[PDB]
Amino acid sequence: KVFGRCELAAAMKRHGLDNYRGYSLGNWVCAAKFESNFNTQATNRNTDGSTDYGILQINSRWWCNDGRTPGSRNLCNIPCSALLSSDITASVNCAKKIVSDGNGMNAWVAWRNRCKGTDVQAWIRGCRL
Ligand SMILES: [Cl-]
Ligand code: NA
């Protein structure tokens, strides 16, 4: 599913990401924008042979099992395929775990490069929340 900006913001708010670990909602919507373009089915292969999955491009090196990343850990304990669902629950719960591991949203390279220290409120501008 390809979310609209406001639809996704609303789904993320309901799932408890608004201010999760100090990160306002615009941040989460901004990251998803540049990570996957709002597409739950987005996948990308990294050079180490690990793959990124879903709306928040969660990495199989650490976070999920996709059965083809030798030596990786499964820190969210889900198949990576569960991150591609049109229901963002699994992606949102795994995100919460990533953002708490000490590095905050700097885990998401597109956030750090494209969202950090920008006007992120602009990504929830005008949505009925
Ligand atoms: Cl932080
Ligand atoms: Na893994």
Residues known to be catalytic: 35, 52
Quote the Cα angle for 64-90-82, to 5°.
60
How big is the chain by its Cα radius of gyration, in Å? 14
Q: State the amino acid at position 45 in one-letter form.
A: R
Locus of tokens 């700097």: 106
Strands 58-59 and 43-45: unpaired
| Centroid of ligand 1 to alpha carbon of 68 (angstroms) | 31
> What contacts 29, CB < 8 A, 6 or more positions away?
5, 8, 9, 12, 120, 123, 124
User: For residue 104, which ligand has an atom nearest its CA?
Assistant: 1
Query: Quick count: other Cβ atoms within 10 Å of Cβ 69?
Result: 20
Give dist(CA 126, CA 45) in Å, integer: 35
CB of 83 within 8 A of CB of 58? yes
Q: Which two tokens stand for residue 48?
A: 């180490």
Residue 101 annotated in ligand binding: yes
| Centroid of ligand 2 to alpha carbon of 65 (angstroms) | 4
- The CATH number, out of the four listed (1.25.40.80, 1.10.580.10, 3.40.50.300, 1.10.530.10), of the domain defined by the range 1-129: 1.10.530.10
User: For residue 79, which ligand has an atom nearest its CA?
Assistant: 2
Comparing C-alpha atoms, which of 63, 57, 81, 61 is closest to residue 72?
Answer: 61
CB of 12 within 8 A of CB of 28? yes
| Centroid of ligand 1 to alpha carbon of 125 (angstroms) | 23
